[PDB]
Design a protein around this motif. Sequence first.
Motif, PDB file in Angstrom:
ATOM      1  N   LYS A 148       0.813  -1.219   0.000  1.00  0.00           N
ATOM      2  CA  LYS A 148       0.000   0.000   0.000  1.00  0.00           C
ATOM      3  C   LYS A 148       0.849   1.273   0.000  1.00  0.00           C
ATOM      4  O   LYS A 148       0.758   2.084  -0.927  1.00  0.00           O
ATOM      5  CB  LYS A 148      -0.827   0.064   1.293  1.00  0.00           C
ATOM      6  N   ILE A 149       1.670   1.485   1.038  1.00  0.00           N
ATOM      7  CA  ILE A 149       2.469   2.719   1.154  1.00  0.00           C
ATOM      8  C   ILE A 149       3.355   2.977  -0.044  1.00  0.00           C
ATOM      9  O   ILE A 149       3.729   4.129  -0.307  1.00  0.00           O
ATOM     10  CB  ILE A 149       3.281   2.775   2.456  1.00  0.00           C
ATOM     11  N   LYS A 164       2.600   3.067  -3.110  1.00  0.00           N
ATOM     12  CA  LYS A 164       1.955   3.787  -4.195  1.00  0.00           C
ATOM     13  C   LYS A 164       2.082   5.276  -4.071  1.00  0.00           C
ATOM     14  O   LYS A 164       1.783   5.848  -3.041  1.00  0.00           O
ATOM     15  CB  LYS A 164       0.490   3.393  -4.315  1.00  0.00           C
ATOM     16  N   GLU A 165       2.515   5.903  -5.145  1.00  0.00           N
ATOM     17  CA  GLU A 165       2.694   7.332  -5.139  1.00  0.00           C
ATOM     18  C   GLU A 165       1.376   8.065  -5.254  1.00  0.00           C
ATOM     19  O   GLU A 165       0.492   7.651  -5.981  1.00  0.00           O
ATOM     20  CB  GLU A 165       3.617   7.738  -6.274  1.00  0.00           C
ATOM     21  N   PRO A 166       1.249   9.168  -4.537  1.00  0.00           N
ATOM     22  CA  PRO A 166       0.019   9.940  -4.575  1.00  0.00           C
ATOM     23  C   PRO A 166      -0.263  10.410  -5.987  1.00  0.00           C
ATOM     24  O   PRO A 166       0.636  10.681  -6.784  1.00  0.00           O
ATOM     25  CB  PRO A 166       0.300  11.094  -3.620  1.00  0.00           C
ATOM     26  N   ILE A 167      -1.527  10.506  -6.273  1.00  0.00           N
ATOM     27  CA  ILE A 167      -2.036  10.864  -7.589  1.00  0.00           C
ATOM     28  C   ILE A 167      -2.117  12.356  -7.718  1.00  0.00           C
ATOM     29  O   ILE A 167      -2.487  13.046  -6.760  1.00  0.00           O
ATOM     30  CB  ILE A 167      -3.410  10.200  -7.815  1.00  0.00           C
ATOM     31  N   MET A 198      -3.419  15.612  -7.923  1.00  0.00           N
ATOM     32  CA  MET A 198      -4.766  16.001  -7.685  1.00  0.00           C
ATOM     33  C   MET A 198      -5.311  16.728  -8.865  1.00  0.00           C
ATOM     34  O   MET A 198      -6.450  17.130  -8.863  1.00  0.00           O
ATOM     35  CB  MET A 198      -4.861  16.939  -6.548  1.00  0.00           C
ATOM     36  N   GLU A 199      -4.487  17.024  -9.804  1.00  0.00           N
ATOM     37  CA  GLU A 199      -4.895  17.736 -10.973  1.00  0.00           C
ATOM     38  C   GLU A 199      -5.260  16.827 -12.106  1.00  0.00           C
ATOM     39  O   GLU A 199      -5.444  17.291 -13.241  1.00  0.00           O
ATOM     40  CB  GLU A 199      -3.816  18.695 -11.344  1.00  0.00           C
ATOM     41  N   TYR A 257       4.305   8.505   7.321  1.00  0.00           N
ATOM     42  CA  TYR A 257       4.346   7.275   6.526  1.00  0.00           C
ATOM     43  C   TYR A 257       3.917   6.042   7.244  1.00  0.00           C
ATOM     44  O   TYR A 257       3.614   5.040   6.619  1.00  0.00           O
ATOM     45  CB  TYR A 257       5.725   6.963   5.977  1.00  0.00           C
ATOM     46  N   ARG A 258       3.854   6.087   8.543  1.00  0.00           N
ATOM     47  CA  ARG A 258       3.248   4.982   9.262  1.00  0.00           C
ATOM     48  C   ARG A 258       2.138   5.598  10.082  1.00  0.00           C
ATOM     49  O   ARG A 258       0.982   5.444   9.743  1.00  0.00           O
ATOM     50  CB  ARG A 258       4.232   4.186  10.104  1.00  0.00           C
ATOM     51  N   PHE A 261       0.115   8.501  10.199  1.00  0.00           N
ATOM     52  CA  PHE A 261       0.110   9.363   9.050  1.00  0.00           C
ATOM     53  C   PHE A 261       0.255  10.784   9.458  1.00  0.00           C
ATOM     54  O   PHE A 261      -0.079  11.649   8.675  1.00  0.00           O
ATOM     55  CB  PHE A 261      -1.064   9.107   8.142  1.00  0.00           C
ATOM     56  N   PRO A 298      -3.678  20.214  -0.151  1.00  0.00           N
ATOM     57  CA  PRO A 298      -3.813  19.164   0.844  1.00  0.00           C
ATOM     58  C   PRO A 298      -3.343  17.832   0.338  1.00  0.00           C
ATOM     59  O   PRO A 298      -3.177  17.631  -0.861  1.00  0.00           O
ATOM     60  CB  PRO A 298      -5.298  19.139   1.135  1.00  0.00           C
ATOM     61  N   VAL A 320      -4.991  14.874   1.311  1.00  0.00           N
ATOM     62  CA  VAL A 320      -6.037  13.941   1.731  1.00  0.00           C
ATOM     63  C   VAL A 320      -6.082  12.565   1.081  1.00  0.00           C
ATOM     64  O   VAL A 320      -5.743  12.402  -0.095  1.00  0.00           O
ATOM     65  CB  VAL A 320      -7.414  14.529   1.456  1.00  0.00           C
ATOM     66  N   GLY A 377      -9.176   2.877  -0.694  1.00  0.00           N
ATOM     67  CA  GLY A 377      -8.175   1.947  -1.093  1.00  0.00           C
ATOM     68  C   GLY A 377      -6.843   2.390  -0.597  1.00  0.00           C
ATOM     69  O   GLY A 377      -5.818   1.844  -1.011  1.00  0.00           O
ATOM     70  N   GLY A 378      -6.839   3.397   0.258  1.00  0.00           N
ATOM     71  CA  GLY A 378      -5.624   3.884   0.839  1.00  0.00           C
ATOM     72  C   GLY A 378      -4.774   4.718  -0.068  1.00  0.00           C
ATOM     73  O   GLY A 378      -3.652   5.047   0.308  1.00  0.00           O
ATOM     74  N   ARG A 379      -5.244   5.060  -1.243  1.00  0.00           N
ATOM     75  CA  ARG A 379      -4.407   5.884  -2.086  1.00  0.00           C
ATOM     76  C   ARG A 379      -4.444   7.309  -1.615  1.00  0.00           C
ATOM     77  O   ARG A 379      -5.374   7.742  -0.933  1.00  0.00           O
ATOM     78  CB  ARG A 379      -4.828   5.782  -3.522  1.00  0.00           C
ATOM     79  N   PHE A 380      -3.417   8.041  -1.977  1.00  0.00           N
ATOM     80  CA  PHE A 380      -3.384   9.423  -1.566  1.00  0.00           C
ATOM     81  C   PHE A 380      -3.476  10.320  -2.779  1.00  0.00           C
ATOM     82  O   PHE A 380      -3.079   9.972  -3.885  1.00  0.00           O
ATOM     83  CB  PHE A 380      -2.120   9.828  -0.853  1.00  0.00           C
ATOM     84  N   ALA A 381      -3.914  11.524  -2.536  1.00  0.00           N
ATOM     85  CA  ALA A 381      -3.966  12.479  -3.601  1.00  0.00           C
ATOM     86  C   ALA A 381      -3.578  13.803  -3.020  1.00  0.00           C
ATOM     87  O   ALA A 381      -3.883  14.087  -1.865  1.00  0.00           O
ATOM     88  CB  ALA A 381      -5.318  12.556  -4.206  1.00  0.00           C
ATOM     89  N   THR A 382      -2.814  14.548  -3.809  1.00  0.00           N
ATOM     90  CA  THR A 382      -2.237  15.815  -3.420  1.00  0.00           C
ATOM     91  C   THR A 382      -2.089  16.849  -4.491  1.00  0.00           C
ATOM     92  O   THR A 382      -2.030  16.569  -5.680  1.00  0.00           O
ATOM     93  CB  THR A 382      -0.820  15.728  -3.016  1.00  0.00           C
ATOM     94  N   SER A 383      -1.999  18.069  -4.004  1.00  0.00           N
ATOM     95  CA  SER A 383      -1.842  19.188  -4.885  1.00  0.00           C
ATOM     96  C   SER A 383      -0.490  19.148  -5.527  1.00  0.00           C
ATOM     97  O   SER A 383       0.414  18.456  -5.061  1.00  0.00           O
ATOM     98  CB  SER A 383      -1.941  20.497  -4.136  1.00  0.00           C
ATOM     99  N   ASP A 384      -0.397  19.766  -6.694  1.00  0.00           N
ATOM    100  CA  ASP A 384       0.908  19.706  -7.302  1.00  0.00           C
ATOM    101  C   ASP A 384       1.903  20.629  -6.603  1.00  0.00           C
ATOM    102  O   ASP A 384       3.083  20.311  -6.567  1.00  0.00           O
ATOM    103  CB  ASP A 384       0.830  19.895  -8.823  1.00  0.00           C
ATOM    104  N   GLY A 422       5.745  14.268 -11.157  1.00  0.00           N
ATOM    105  CA  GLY A 422       6.353  13.000 -10.901  1.00  0.00           C
ATOM    106  C   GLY A 422       5.600  11.834 -11.464  1.00  0.00           C
ATOM    107  O   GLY A 422       4.380  11.702 -11.328  1.00  0.00           O
TER     108      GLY A 422
END
Lengths: 121, 99, 50, 1166, 73, 89
Positions: free
Chosen positions: A8-9, A11-14, A16-17, D39-40, D42, D244, D246, D250-257, D311
């Motif tokens: 799980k950890i 995976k790189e964050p997506i 947001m754009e 990372y652990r 969070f 953010p 947030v 499924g535990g994925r993360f999403a963030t601003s560029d 990235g």
Amino acid sequence: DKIRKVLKIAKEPISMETPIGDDEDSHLGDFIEDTTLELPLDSATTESLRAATHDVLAGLTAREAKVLRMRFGIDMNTDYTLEEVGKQFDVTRERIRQIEAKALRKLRHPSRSEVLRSFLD
Amino acid sequence: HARSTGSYSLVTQQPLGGKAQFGGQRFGEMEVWALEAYGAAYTLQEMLTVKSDDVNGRTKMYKNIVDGNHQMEPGMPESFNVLLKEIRSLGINIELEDE
Amino acid sequence: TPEEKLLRAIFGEKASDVKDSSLRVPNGVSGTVIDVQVFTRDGVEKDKRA
Amino acid sequence: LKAQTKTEEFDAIKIALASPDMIRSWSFGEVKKPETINYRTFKPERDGLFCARIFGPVKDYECLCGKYKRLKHRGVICEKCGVEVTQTKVRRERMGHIELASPTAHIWFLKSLPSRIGLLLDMPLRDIERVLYFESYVVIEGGMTNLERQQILTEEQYLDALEEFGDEFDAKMGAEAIQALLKSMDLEQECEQLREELNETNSETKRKKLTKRIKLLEAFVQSGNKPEWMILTVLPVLPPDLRPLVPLDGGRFATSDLNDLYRRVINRNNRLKRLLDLAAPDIIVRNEKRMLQEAVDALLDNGRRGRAITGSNKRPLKSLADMIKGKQGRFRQNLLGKRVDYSGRSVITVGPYLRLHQCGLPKKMALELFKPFIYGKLELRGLATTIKAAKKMVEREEAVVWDILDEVIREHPVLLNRAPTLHRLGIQAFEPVLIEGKAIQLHPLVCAAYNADFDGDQMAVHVPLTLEAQLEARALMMSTNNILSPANGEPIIVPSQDVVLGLYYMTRDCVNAKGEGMVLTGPKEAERLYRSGLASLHARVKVRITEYEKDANGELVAKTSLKDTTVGRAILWMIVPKGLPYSIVNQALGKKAISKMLNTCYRILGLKPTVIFADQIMYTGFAYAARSGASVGIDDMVIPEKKHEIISEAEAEVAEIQEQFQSGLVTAGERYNKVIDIWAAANDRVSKAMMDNLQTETVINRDGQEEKQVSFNSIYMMADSGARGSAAQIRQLAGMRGLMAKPDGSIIETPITANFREGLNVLQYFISTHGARKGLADTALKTANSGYLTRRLVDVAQDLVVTEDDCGTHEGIMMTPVIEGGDVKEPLRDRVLGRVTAEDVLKPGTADILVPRNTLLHEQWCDLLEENSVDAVKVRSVVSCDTDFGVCAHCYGRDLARGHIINKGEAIGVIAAQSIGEPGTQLTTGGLPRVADLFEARRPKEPAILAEISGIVSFGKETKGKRRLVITPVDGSDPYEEMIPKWRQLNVFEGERVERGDVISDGPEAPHDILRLRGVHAVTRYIVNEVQDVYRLQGVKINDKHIEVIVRQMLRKATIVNAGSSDFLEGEQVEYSRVKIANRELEANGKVGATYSRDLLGITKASLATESFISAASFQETTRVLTEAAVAGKRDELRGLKENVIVGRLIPAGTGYAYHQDRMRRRAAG
Amino acid sequence: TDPVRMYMREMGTVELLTREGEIDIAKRIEDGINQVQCSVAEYPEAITYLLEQYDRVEAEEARLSDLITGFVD
Amino acid sequence: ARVTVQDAVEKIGNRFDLVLVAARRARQMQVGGKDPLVPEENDKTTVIALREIEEGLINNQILDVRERQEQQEQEAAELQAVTAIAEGR
Ligand SMILES: [Mg+2]
Ligand SMILES: [Zn+2]
Ligand SMILES: [Zn+2]
């Protein structure tokens, strides 16, 4: 089984754009709702439940109101162990626990009861 | 579809359907002009502040609506409030003057 | 909260360590169930119905 | 009194450059590390982009470490991990900063196109960059040696130059130098030096550039910005919650560029800090320095150098400049739109039962829409113990709530809106009527204003919440209060199609019908005759009617007489209220007359009767139309008996001309035109053949043999009535349809000989396709152009509002009917209606004032002017209104959906723009682009030229490519000589005296001339008539008012000529200027007042200049707007519309106009 | 621009070292340092400090890892 | 209902200053500080205020007039309480 945690950890964050659909200004981030907010139909009921408990606690004898506000955090920092209350009332120990019971008992049987029951679900 | 009070976007506090209890209808540029041609400002203010973007004003309104007092204590649209930090995140000092 | 704590106290409900996530039918739409499928991760014990 | 120090309610706004200490003011902490979350756990890593210490608690009122979790603890900074426990909301507010190692350039001031730093140092861009990448050295404060202050040197040169003078010569390279340059720069001294050179040296090339620069410098001086600040020491960091991290499912993360960006600036920055203590070689710290610059550039505005990509994801990461711009052209989230609570939408349907003031709303939509209102009424009456239970009730849909909803709904309007909102009528208020079903029911009469067909169009609904919105809605947006188009005073509520077929079928008469000739006391018994089956709806009959005329003083005369009429007109008379004469209904009642019926009703009896009249007209229209049973069968479309014969003859002609071409008697080109001419002519013939047969051929008998009247055939009734269809479309049904055109634009010489009643064969259909497909394509584009035009239009006007009452200028324009070449392509009576007279107008004899100076000319007055033969009227216009920063109502007009003179504070520009734009869909040099050229002031392609000055002219010099024209004024000086290319055939007579502005050639003329040479009234007259030529030709009614205000905004600017207070060539506002020389005529200089020259700016150009920078930042290019403002320290005072919407407060117009007034005066007050 | 280019070209000026040149510079290094060691060796406060520091190490106020990296040997 | 407000625009000309005044009055009615000046038909306060405008018994002058009196009606009651704040001395 740590495969899952580890897997799980990694995976790189997506971004947001990430454009999603239509190529339109819909961006992944535009769809992320705020969860720490509080729905107003809730915020509204809090202001009411205060007023509720505040009214019904004036419906009791002044010591029954203080003892219950004491035994819970109502309009006060923390709450007080029942021994503390006995010392505050100079009438102590087992006695106080009884008053609490009648107070809850007094709000239980409806005249009192019709309004506070409507708060649960 | 109809919505009274729904979910909200995180990045900008704005109506967002998250439950498929749909996000509100979009009031666009052209519709704004329409309100400007009528002289109705308050309809317009309430549209873009309390009915939408004011994370404070929105709840402050609802509590008045049930109380039976129709008013708005608008405060500042959060959209613009973000633009302000965004300008200020660049090298620009942008201030709100006077009184 | 304090007043919430009193509320459970009067009506004597044990507030659960669990919250309700259950899937329920959308508002206004109504029908007959013609089927149910159950998918399980490999290794979790399949429940009774499944 | 205490001024203040805390949160009272601000006016204006200021923008400027940021000091490093200033940036530090905001920062609550230094972000020192790229780490984000653990990372652990969070949890946020401390001293990283997300930091509890710098920014804020992750969750409300709770310490990070968790020692202090209680809501009681508030101003507490945890002793463990410093976090002041407060709402997490503050993670959205608090900023931070970063102390950069080596100075760094701000991409906005380096690269917005006119590099500000460049011209502030008067140094080229390419050179400055050369100093930044450490590719060359620049001198600073050179002292007296060999070298200029801004001079740039190379490696060897620096070295060699250093050997000669160790000190008293100075040079740096890279960012510090520029910072060194800017700090050293003394602007004031530069100002003086530039002042001396201005006076001493005279050259246009020289002093042009000279004067331009000095303003900037002193501007920058006056700004308060210190040039060093264009170079960044400290870089603020945007609050975390605005970019953010947030989690997702499924535990994925999403963030601003920005994080990816921000992270980089830090890393690179930090590496540099290390590289200093390791004393790395220069080639490295330099490279690191360049890299640091690049990272900041990518953070701030990405895309001005390389466009760094996110990235693992190809798509380039978005920077703060891209955050501000938003997209969809120029839209800052006020402009594209904003989602709104309390709203909804769904498909709309008919509901003929409705009164005009209400609309059908689905029960459930109404439940969910008013949910909070319902809660409040439910516990007001005590039907619900508390708010929670109220929710449970309506969620339960207990029977009692429906009645409660009827209470909260009653007086409580809702806004209804349709998709392309064009004029203000796109949103109108209605009173809700609860309706089972999911569809919105919409009053038919309104369907025209919305341009809403019923083919599945959806409408959206909005609940006005605040009380003021209820009262705004009821007195402004209510349906009944706008019954008249704002574009032209004609009623927009006119019945549409079924209703007009009814009334036409009602009042029409055949020659012989049941009940013909009898007589009746009054309409009551006329209906009694009809409903019973005795009398036909249409038969010529005499009946006694009583009409009324109020022509007394506020008083109704009554008169009864025997009118010769039909049964239908008699029946209908029951509806016409009061005032009106029976004369109005005694006709056939087509759609046109039926509208003026409504119009007169309004202009005579007032509003309320017109509404209620209107309701009645619809109800009765549908009904009798329903009785009539009009239908359409295939035999209702009658083809002429002579069609085949016409075609055949025209077919001989083409074969004759072919023989003439076969024998060469006529040329090929001549032939094509020839065949087309006969075919075109043939079609007209068939059209006017089938039209004759179809129209009157009902040939009938009364007591005699025969007689013939206009047909009662269905489809004719439709077209005649005005209900639907037109001779053109009919001609395609029965007569042959057209001559199509091949894609390239030629038009085929074998027309389509068949029609729809017959079949079209293969070939014919195929040919029809091209025209069809081009239509849809064409319309969808003309759609887009219209939208584009209204945009530019509201942009150039917008903030214009009626402000003063009467400016009291006698000034105005002379109104005549358009009278084009024939008789009266448009009358005078329509042009002057509702405007106000410039001066008292005479009868043919005088000391007889018919209308006295400024008086609103309404219907009676126009008729009195019409009684007399009066041919010319000077009328006040918005172009001439003397008021600055607005229009005086006296100069505007009456127009509104209400007839009363325009109120103080209504914002007219918008309604002007809207009025011009909405019809624009219907238009098609010539066409809509012709309109655009006009409003854009564009100079034509092959223009004519006008006499610069009066007096006798002659030709001078010879053919150089220009043959000079020498003008010789009688009294005045000759010297005007214009260079005219002589290969353009002239007009102007070589031996005649020409007035300035005469026609010196032919061809179109640039309105610049007309403004310059002929004057304001001419160009404004020119504008109105040419664009109006386009619309009226297209069949569009648009009052000249609206066009006139757009013009006023077009001429908003002027260029000074004389002097004595401000600068010579400055282009400037005539509002501002006139106010200064009106101020200067007294006190001050006795008069130093300066003479100017009016200028013509196209809309898109004039819309460019706006005092409020937030407004400009909306529709113009943001980066450029913000920078160019940020240097000047420009202070936006708001005062306009666009801007108030952005920040979200009351519009300084309409309802708010009262407010702004009270505040604007409080401002600049004490 | 694009600093890879203004870098590649800035280092590209530097000529690769001859196999002999490496040692030259390396020898040069030794000298510089060897001077400071000797320059350090000549300071009186520098000795007594080391002495006073070793008296703290045998006194359990520090550790051997915090003073010397080892001697010759 | 009030189908058309035309009559009120006559009582106060502007029609925008009209919206404000009726609002001000409607709050005098909605928030319970006062009571209606004319029979309420179940018309909500929105319209009740509009009926009051049409009848000319409520406009900005009167309201400002009425309000100015209430300032003094309250200044009369508390007269002793606030003069007791002489503790400022
Ligand atoms: Mg359609
Ligand atoms: Zn802590
Ligand atoms: Zn004027």
